[PDB]
Each structure stands twice: as C-alpha cells, then as structure tokens.
C-alpha cells in the first residue's frame, strides 16, 4: 500500500483551530485535510512543490495569470484537489479569495528582472505586503516566504535589496512567518544555470567565472518546503538551503563541458559593456539578462550561520557532479562509437550488399 510519507500522524490540528483527519493510504484518492495556496506554482520551483503536495491529496489553490502555462498542474492530483483562480497583485479581493480557506500559504513570487508594470520593488516588497496583510486578516496559521539567497537590505544588487525588504516586512506583519533562503537551484528546465550552459551559444562574465556559491537540486528544496509546511516547529524561523559543496562558476562550466563532450563557449568581456548590452536587450519582449544580474556576478554567496539548514529537517542534499549526467545527457551529442578497429574481420562475415 501507499504511505503518507509527508505526515507523521493522521490527526493534525492547525494553529487556527481546524481539525484535519487524514483519509486513505496516501495515493491519488487520499486526502490530507490540508488546504494550501501557492502563488507561483506556474514556475520552476512551485511546479515541483504542487506535485509533492497534491500527490498525497492536499488541496492546492493555484493562482494564475496565463491560462495555458498552468495546465500541466491539473495532472498532479485527483479531481477537486487542484483548484485554480485568476489573480493579480493589483486586485486585492483575488488574494483574499485565494488565501481564505487555506491552512498554509506559500509565496514563491519574484522575477529575476524588471518590467513595465512591475519593478523589483513592486513585486518583491509590495506584493509581499499585500499577501501578508491578507494572511494576517484571515489569520492563516502558516506562512512560508521564499526570499533569495545572499539577501541583504542594502546591497549593490537591487534584487537582493528588495528580497531583504520583503523579508523584514513579511516578518514585521506576520511574526509567525517562516522564511526560506534557497541558493541557486538547478535541475531539468532550469532558468539560468544548466539549460543555459548547455544551450547558450556563448557565456559572459563581467567578473571572471569566479562568483562562488553553493547550488542545490530543486527537488530537494521542494522536499524542504514540504517538510516545513507540515512541521509547526518552524514558525518564526529562517533557513539557508545551500548545499554541501562550494562551486565557482568556472568549476561548474568545466563539469558541464566534460559531461557534454562539447566545448562550452565563454568570453569574459568586462562589466560596463555587458551591462550596456543587457540594458538594451530589456526592450525586446522576451526575458533576457538584465542590468542588475551582471551586478550579482560579483556577489558570492555569504551564508548566514544563525539559520537552520537541511540537517534540521532530516535531509541529505544532493551533489552537482553526480546529477549533471542525468541533467545533461539529453544535450550529449554522442558523436559515434570509439575505436572501430578490430571490427573489420567481424564485419567481413556478414552480407552487406544484397542482390
């Protein structure tokens, strides 16, 4: 039979005064009782999260803006489990609707770039404040913000500045808020890491490929958010999900090139020129690197040692050099067989040309 691998018990009780009795063995038909809300399930991390939540029958409310990106989530659970709402941070009633009946809330909002309708401030600060005020009004028992690694309130990067302001506002309205701080995530169809090193015609670094970091598999961060949504010990806490092994950019690129058996192209042209070329590419409608991210190329990962980690959740986070084979074998060209010699004499026995 199947199992409720996520739950430690069957009768759980939220901090809002709801009783949640589990039903079943933990398969597609089961129900965990819980009702959550994930504000970015359409994206890279939230997709894996809703998959792990709805595999066990947890009701999942998924706010969307594009109707067509989401459809790949309805597969993740039985009927009635995954529920969709059209929402926008510029409409408040939509946010109250999404969070009303929820025991858990999960904020994954945030672009790696600015737009015409949303600057970094409006999406990482004001959006967090709107959600927090609604999480507070309705007194939702749990709130699980995700704010980027290296976040610091004042910093050369505006992204990390906002991400730090989003932290303090959430925690200054919702005191029981949990905050996670993942490091650069990697996996299949990642944004800016392996699909780029494997597809992009040429890389560039305003520094050298020297920015140091601890990357991590995204499935494990999704496992972490699962092991935090249900553990009530994690209120008014902070996490640093970074990973065992420290990797410079050039190290990752060399492993990528080795596994791919193709020579990745890197250039290493200076800062102001790349910063200008990025600025001019922000006028075309599709996402591209933005002036504030080449700024983060000079900002290596400072880890906060006062915050919890994977080992506080009984997790064993994975290593990049093992997983790169699984993640890059599709782009492996595999030109041909090695050393065809000592095969002429064997081929000579077969009929190659029929008449």
């Amino acid at each position: 039979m199947n199992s409720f691998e996520n739950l430690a018990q069957d009768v759980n009780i939220t901090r809002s005064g709801k009783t949640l009795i589990a039903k079943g063995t933990g398969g597609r038909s089961s129900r965990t009782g819980y009702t959550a809300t994930v504000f970015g399930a359409n994206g890279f991390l939230g997709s894996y999260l809703t998959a792990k939540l709805a595999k066990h029958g947890t009701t999942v409310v998924v706010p969307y803006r594009e109707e067509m990106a989401k459809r790949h989530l309805k597969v993740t659970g039985d009927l009635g489990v995954v529920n969709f709402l059209e929402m926008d941070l510029r409409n408040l009633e939509s946010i109250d609707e999404a969070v009303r009946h929820s025991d858990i809330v999960v904020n994954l909002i945030g672009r790696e770039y600015e737009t015409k309708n949303f600057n970094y401030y409006d999406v990482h600060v004001e959006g967090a404040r709107r959600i927090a005020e609604a999480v507070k009004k309705h007194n939702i028992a749990r709130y699980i913000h995700v704010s980027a690694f290296n976040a610091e309130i004042d910093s050369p990067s505006e992204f990390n500045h906002t991400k730090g302001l989003g932290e303090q506002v959430t925690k200054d309205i919702v005191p029981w808020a949990t905050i996670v701080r993942p490091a650069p995530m990697f996996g299949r169809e990642d944004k800016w890491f392996l699909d780029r090193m494997a597809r992009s015609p040429c890389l560039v670094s305003a520094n050298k490929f020297q920015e140091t970091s601890n990357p991590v598999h995204v499935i494990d961060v999704a496992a972490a958010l699962e092991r935090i949504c249900f553990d009530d010990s994690t209120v008014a806490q902070t996490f640093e999900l970074y990973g065992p092994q420290k990797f410079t950019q050039k190290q990752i690129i060399d492993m990528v090139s080795e596994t791919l058996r193709k020579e990745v192209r890197h250039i290493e042209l200076p800062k102001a020129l790349y910063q200008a070329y990025t600025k001019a590419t922000q006028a075309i409608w599709w996402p591209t690197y933005s002036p504030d991210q080449v700024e983060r190329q000079f900002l290596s990962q400072k880890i906060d040692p006062s915050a919890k980690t994977f080992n506080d959740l009984d997790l064993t986070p994975m290593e990049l050099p093992d997983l790169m084979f699984k993640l890059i074998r599709p782009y492996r060209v595999n030109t041909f067989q090695h050393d065809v010699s000592q095969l002429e004499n064997k081929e000579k026995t077969f009929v190659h040309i029929l008449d």
Binding site: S3, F4, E5, N6, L7, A8, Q9, D10, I219, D220, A223, E226, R227, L313, D314, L315, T316, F325, K326, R329
Partner: protein, 123 residues
C-alpha cells in the same frame, strides 16, 4: 512456419536440478553481459554495477527454492524478461519498476517502529 523471435528459448522442463543449475547460470551470465545494453537502450540515471546488484538480488530472492517444477517456472519467466529487455520492447517505466531504490527518498517519515505506525494507523 511462425518462426521464433530473436532470443527465444523453447520451453523445456528439465527433469533434474543439475541441468537447471547450468541453465540458470547461463541466464545470469547473459543478464550481466547485457546490462550495459540495458543502460543504453533505456535512458538510465545510475550505474551498471547497480543494475548488476539488482540482478544479483533478484536471483538471491529465489535461491532457497528446492521444488524442481517451481524452479523451471522461475527460469522460464526469467528468460521471458531477458527477451523483453534486450529486445527493446519494454520502455523506461516497465524497467525502472525494478529500481524503486534509485528514485529520491519518498518523504521523511517512513515508519519502522510501532508507535509511528499507530500514529499513522498502519499497525
């Protein structure tokens, strides 16, 4: 006449344990020699040694079976699976049915003592 496929063996029920010993050993040898093919044909995310480990486990499963007819049945079923795997009939899912372990740890609480099973109503 409807001729046999590639790696087909005619079903033949041996009357002795001493011959089936040899036939089983040849099957094990073929599985091992063909494991790299089982890694290439199926897009596998682990080692050839881990495949050989699982094969050894599957053969240790029925190591202590002394009824001759049941052994003949087991050998025939194993040759069926070798024919299914080496010819590219199985797809990835039906093959990785044999490798649950390699997939990521399913959650946190995997009960092993009584009290946890009771809290999860599995006792």
């Amino acid at each position: 006449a409807i001729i046999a496929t590639a790696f087909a063996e005619t079903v033949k029920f041996s009357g002795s344990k001493q011959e089936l010993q040899k036939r089983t050993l040849a099957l094990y040898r073929q599985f091992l020699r063909g494991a790299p093919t089982f890694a290439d044909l199926y897009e596998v995310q682990f080692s050839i040694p881990t495949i050989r480990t699982k094969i050894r486990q599957e053969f240790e499963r029925h190591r202590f079976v002394d009824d001759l007819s049941i052994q003949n049945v087991l050998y025939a079923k194993g040759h069926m699976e070798y024919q299914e795997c080496i010819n590219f009939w199985k797809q990835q899912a039906q093959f990785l049915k044999y490798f649950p372990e390699e997939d990521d740890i399913q959650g946190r609480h995997q009960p092993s003592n009584f009290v946890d099973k009771f809290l999860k109503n599995r006792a």
